[PDB]
Amino acid sequence: SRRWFHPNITGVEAENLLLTRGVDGSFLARPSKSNPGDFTLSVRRNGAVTHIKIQNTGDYYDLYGGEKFATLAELVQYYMEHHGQLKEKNGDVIELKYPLNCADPTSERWFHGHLSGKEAEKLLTEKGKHGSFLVRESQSHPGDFVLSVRTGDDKNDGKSKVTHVMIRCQELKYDVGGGERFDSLTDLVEHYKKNPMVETLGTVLQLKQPLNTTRINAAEIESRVRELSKGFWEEFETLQQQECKLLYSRKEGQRQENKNKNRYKNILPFDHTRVVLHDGDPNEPVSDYINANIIMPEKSYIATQGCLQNTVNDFWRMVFQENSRVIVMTTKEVERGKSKCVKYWPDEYALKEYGVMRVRNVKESAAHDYTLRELKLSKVGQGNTERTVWQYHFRTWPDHGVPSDPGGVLDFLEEVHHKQESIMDAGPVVVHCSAGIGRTGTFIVIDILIDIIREKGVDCDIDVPKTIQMVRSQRSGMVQTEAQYRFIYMAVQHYIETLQRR
Ligand SMILES: Nc1ccc2[nH]ccc2n1
């Protein structure tokens, strides 16, 4: 369902699982132990298991002998609807039919593992609300679990309370002492989230939301980073597990008429946040589509792909229409010999027409990590529509992974920030890389987080994974890898330490 990912399995456990508990068409996904960014899709077919490698270096999930995807969930959805579409090197079809579910609860937000009832009561009392709950290992009955839930009023008078429900684990099935025996804690929790338990005297044990364990005071960032450095992996895992909630429709990008406007055919903008282009060529049957989404913190952004030859004109329609005055480009045009973005700006001192739009490149300035290009955009035939668009082109991002130090990125975003804020009623900041989800998401999330610290100073609340999940609900797969997740925390930490130095 949303449990086909096995975070702690090994290759051999995965084979035995598929062979003992699965059938032909059964599959699961799992991480490599050794090489973060590597994943395996394990699949039973013809009474044997095939392992298909998936690689992610920061831009997308690349399935060997398949396509590129924004998220593993989107990959799984695509092949569970397209059979015969995943091919072996033989050229034979590999069918994904029957997800093989994982029982491991460590990636669930509500699971806290080693925690006493006393620390649970303190956290629910401090951080918890009516319906806030967690699951923990039992102290009194080793091997069992306990569900702890706060109920009552959110307005220490005693009309709130915490109730602890024993969960028995008996032959790898879980129960609350009567009724149904569940295959996983996840199934138990989902069941009593639907069909809540009622105490003898009426209190309904509503399981509304897990306890928040990721929010920190920005001033204590150093403690959390030290703490997460011995983990980052589990926190990222918990976040990744939540991507099964985000399979929003992308129908406009899947239209025949829009196919060749996507750099990657399965990395598409969500319908609900896509940038819609108005004023199109009346001849062009579909002229309203670009692979771009509005991103609102919840200053806005447009997250988009690097231009194709045939979408350059669309890109400039978008910039013009949305009144954007700043463009952030986080890729070189070419990396590893592959075009990542076509050159959609004119050479310095030159002027080019891109369909109905004209752009002049007034001046380039080189800095250590970036080039700034001062561009003037206007509509042909209409002189008083000219506005300056500042393209900040970050040029030193490594081909794979992330930079070792966040200083160049932070200086770059500070400059982008001051430029944006200097322009009265500027539209959203446009941000793009290649596919528009990995680097792009990383730069956007860092900018959202630093902006909070900018407004509210060092004694304010930040929550990295909730920020990422919020951005991921507006464009598929924003922030691609654990290295990018760690870099975000590194970037915030550096920003905070520099304020404290003053
Ligand atoms: N539970 C999940 C689901 C999808 C994922 N992609 C990378 C890690 C991961 N974990």
Write a concise keyword list for the protein shown above:
502 residues, alpha+beta, SHC Adaptor Protein, Protein-Tyrosine Phosphatase, Chain A, 3 domains, 9-stranded mixed beta sheet, 6-stranded mixed beta sheet, 26 strands, binds 1H-pyrrolo[3,2-b]pyridin-5-amine, nucleus, insulin receptor binding, protein kinase binding, phosphotyrosine residue binding, protein tyrosine kinase binding
Structural class: alpha+beta
Beta-strand content: 25-35%
Unique bound compounds: 1H-pyrrolo[3,2-b]pyridin-5-amine
Termini gap: 51 Å
- Shape, please? globular
Biggest sheet layout:
9 strands, mixed
Keywords: Acetylation, Cytoplasm, Deafness, Disease variant, Hydrolase, Nucleus, Phosphoprotein, Protein phosphatase, Repeat, SH2 domain
Organism: Homo sapiens
GO cellular component, one term: protein-containing complex
GO biological process, one term: atrioventricular canal development
What does this structure look like?
Helix 9 packs across helix 10 and helix 9 packs parallel to helix 11 (482-501). Strand 7 and strand 8 (145-152) form a beta hairpin. The chain has helices at 11-21, 72-81, 117-127, 185-194, 221-228, 232-241, 312-321, 407-421, 438-456, 464-472, 482-501, and strands at 26-31, 38-45, 48-55, 61-63, 68-69, 98-99, 132-137, 145-152, 160-170, 173-175, 197-198, 204-205, 209-210, 216-217, 274-276, 289-295, 301-304, 326-329, 334-335, 338-339, 351-354, 357-366, 370-379, 382-394, 429-432, 461-462. The chain has three domains: 11-99, SHC Adaptor Protein (2-Layer Sandwich), CATH 3.30.505; 117-212, SHC Adaptor Protein; 217-501, Alpha-Beta Complex (Protein-Tyrosine Phosphatase, Chain A), CATH 3.90.190. It has 502 residues and is of the alpha+beta class. Helices cover 26% and strands 26% of the residues. The PDB classes it as signaling protein.
